[PDB]
Design an enzyme around this catalytic site. Sequence first.
Site, PDB file in Angstrom:
ATOM      1  N   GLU B  17     -51.444  25.344   1.875  1.00 12.76           N
ATOM      2  CA  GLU B  17     -50.289  25.805   2.587  1.00 12.76           C
ATOM      3  C   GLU B  17     -50.958  26.399   3.882  1.00 12.76           C
ATOM      4  O   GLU B  17     -50.124  26.440   5.020  1.00 12.76           O
ATOM      5  CB  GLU B  17     -49.207  26.395   2.108  1.00 12.76           C
ATOM      6  N   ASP B  26     -43.663  21.770  10.208  1.00 12.67           N
ATOM      7  CA  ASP B  26     -44.909  21.172   9.107  1.00 12.67           C
ATOM      8  C   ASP B  26     -45.052  19.760   9.616  1.00 12.67           C
ATOM      9  O   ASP B  26     -45.890  19.217   8.809  1.00 12.67           O
ATOM     10  CB  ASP B  26     -44.188  21.289   7.665  1.00 12.67           C
TER      11      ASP B  26
END
Lengths: 147, 146
Positions: B17, B26
């Site tokens: 992440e 993202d």
Amino acid sequence: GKTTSDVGVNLISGFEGTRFTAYDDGVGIWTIGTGTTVYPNGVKVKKGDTCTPEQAKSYFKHDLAKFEKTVNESVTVPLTQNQFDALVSLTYNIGAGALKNSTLLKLLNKGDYKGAADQFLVWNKAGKVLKGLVRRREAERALFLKK
Amino acid sequence: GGKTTSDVGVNLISGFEGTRFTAYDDGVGIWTIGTGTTVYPNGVKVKKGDTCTPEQAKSYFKHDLAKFEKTVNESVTVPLTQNQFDALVSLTYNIGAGALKNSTLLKLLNKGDYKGAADQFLVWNKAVLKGLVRRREAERALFLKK
């Protein structure tokens, strides 16, 4: 020469942590950002210092370039990117002088990869064997030996 | 009582992440901050311009870790090693509880077909992207590690 990869940056960042107020690293060296103890202009991190994310990023990048130069100029044998990342992490934690004087580097520059990988593990001391340093040296050794 | 994510699983999830202190897109249009956080513990969605501190990112990560640990503990009816639990938590963190619960991965897993579920890890690589490929492969390898 080489530069640290995303894998190595993430390893270092994970073991250093990131904080935006200065803290004592346990051995009496005040630290800020992602393991920064000396600002790029030579000023030492001191209690009460604060920084922003971008400032911590800049200090981290500066010190990364510094230790990348240390590794590139000290190691006379070929390295994989894994081994370069591991050595940069180690030198970030222990310093350029410690690397240059280590038996790790002696073995490495004799071409003894396994000996140097094993010599990773002797740098687990706080002046006390701390466990976090043990896990860090083990992870660095595992990256160093990963093909 | 069930399992909780181990240091290995926390390290895997955090490593894939990353951690960031300003909100970012993202890639699929979900604004993200901290260590993959997209929904704050009080239900507020991460939005553009949000900032956080390291301690806040840690708190949000811990909250979401506990949530997905529950999803895994309550959804899987077969024994798991700690490795398999960590891998499943990483996967579910990335894809969500609904996707897991409806996946053929979970059906095979709960039939006792560990190998099939491990292989079903690999189909969750789409927006087909490469970082997701690497992550699903690492999760499958952890899942199969004894």
